[PDB]
Curated annotation (Swiss-Prot), chains A, B:
Gene Ontology cellular component annotations, sorted alphabetically: cell envelope; membrane; outer membrane-bounded periplasmic space
Residues of the full protein shown: 89 to 385 of 407
Protein name in UniProt: Cation efflux system protein CusB
Origin superkingdom: Bacteria
GO terms under biological process: copper ion export; copper ion transmembrane transport; detoxification of copper ion; intracellular copper ion homeostasis; plasma membrane copper ion transport; response to copper ion; response to silver ion; response to toxic substance
Function of the protein: Part of a cation efflux system that mediates resistance to copper and silver.
Length: 297, 297
């Protein structure tokens, strides 16, 4: 006939990629917590417009506390400077003050204006969301006490339930595709990942935590999430799923001899996945085949 | 480190074994059957006490049928024998009656007793169990119609569903273990397995046709059966679970220097299952570790 009209593809060896989807729940990191504690004893004042679940940044305000004890050993210092004292013990008294817990900032103000450092406003360390707070103005804070607990949310924590038999198969965070029913437009980025070895006696499941990048504050613990995972398979003979044809107990395809000529070739399919099929027996690597051809008998 | 009463085990490279469990349907094998089809057309007599689900032995009864068209061809043949009929033409018609559909030893009973053969009871081939066999007393058959068929129990067919992702991991049927709720048999030997490359779009599960040796007769299609599978994993550094210790970020064990002396080595467990654990990074093959006992500090 000589009326050819074809597009081709070439046999290769490689794995099959297996799609599989799992349920994940957004979560807050137990490393991204802060505990605002108080070095030394004192008494509260002010308190600020923080209710118990707001959002603070690098803790700008939080509460002012007066502290006795301190002022006494800052004053006895003011005389020593006023009385030609050893520039070693004046700074020595400051070192024992830094030990007590004095902010180097108010120390720097004591050296300048000399006006004694009365009470100071303590500020929260991280950005985040207040988890537990309370307190009222005019309490005595013991030693180091918890004045506040904060929760960061710059990283987030989706955790899928994985079969243990498939865990050793993971490897690279590029098989992870993360997607959420809610707020869908955002493209989640899996900054890290890890496999908390604790196996779910409930069936045989591993926990697969993924640190997701939360910088649009558009992720809330409890949201529904879908982990579109991917896997491989010991390398097999890959032909473009399209190029294969079956009629029943018989399954084969077209071979190309670089001569533009065709020929029947019986193959034995292993299985198919995502776009291609892999043969148990049949052809051989390099061999050519046709994925988009068209002709009659 | 000064106590005797300690046991020990050594780090050894190897794979983990993940046992699983799937639901298997029992089934009759499509190949171990026997169709009792009738050549030519005709009409039924007798039909015997078979009911459509009974036990037979080389189908020694079944049903009788008679044929109008056949008795005619033989008759004229008989007149050749009586008159002057060429030796080769009398056969010419016996050759046209064999292919017509006549049983041989029915034709050899024609030539033997010169009697028009008209009624042939037809037996069923195999020892088995009747599937399909309703029709009775005086009906019309044709071409090669099916008057009956039979099933065998020498092989039985449990077919568990497997996920495509774990499929390529199968191999060797020694990682198979079949079990039954009803009639927990001594043991049920797996004589041959086979993975049908058909992906059930319903789910992503491949069929795992499993041929069960049933020389006995204790299996029946429709029953429920459990198939427990034994997967593995690319090798890792294996230690006895007992031999590992950690309750926080500390996460490791004890090394033995053959001197009977010890040392803390910080490891990182990949995952575990069964009764052993696979290290990510920590120890080195051959390195010894303690699996029991203790000592003071």
């Amino acid at each position: 006939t000589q009326n050819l009209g074809v597009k081709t593809a070439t046999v290769t060896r490689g794995p099959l990629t297996f799609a599989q989807s799992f349920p994940a729940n957004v979560s807050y990191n137990e490393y991204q917590y802060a505990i605002v504690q108080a070095r030394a004893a004192g008494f509260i004042d002010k308190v600020y417009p923080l209710t118990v679940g707001d959002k603070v940044q690098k803790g700008t305000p939080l509460l002012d506390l007066t502290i006795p004890d301190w002022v006494e050993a800052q004053s006895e210092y003011l005389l020593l400077r006023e009385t030609g004292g050893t520039a070693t013990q004046t700074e020595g008294i400051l070192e024992r003050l830094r030990l007590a817990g004095m902010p180097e900032a108010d120390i720097r103000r004591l050296i300048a204006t000399q006006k004694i450092q009365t009470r100071f406003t303590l500020k929260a360390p991280i950005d985040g969301v207040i988890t537990a707070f309370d307190l009222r103005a005019g309490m005595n804070i013991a030693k180091d006490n918890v004045v506040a607990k904060i929760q960061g949310m710059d990283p987030v924590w989706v955790t899928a339930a994985i079969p243990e038999s498939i865990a050793w198969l993971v490897k690279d965070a590029s098989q992870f595709t993360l997607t959420v029913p809610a707020r869908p437009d955002k493209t989640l980025t899996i900054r890290k990942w890890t496999l908390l070895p604790g196996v779910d006696a409930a069936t045989r499941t591993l926990q697969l935590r993924l640190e997701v990048d939360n910088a649009d504050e558009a992720l809330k613990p409890g949201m529904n999430a879908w982990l579109q995972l991917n896997t491989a398979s010991e390398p097999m003979l890959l032909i473009p799923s399209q190029a294969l044809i079956d009629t029943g107990s018989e399954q084969r395809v077209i071979t190309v001899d670089a001569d533009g000529r065709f020929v029947p070739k019986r193959v034995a399919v292993f299985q198919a996945s995502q776009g291609v099929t892999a043969l148990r027996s049949g052809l051989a690597e390099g061999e050519k085949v046709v994925s988009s051809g068209l002709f009659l008998i």
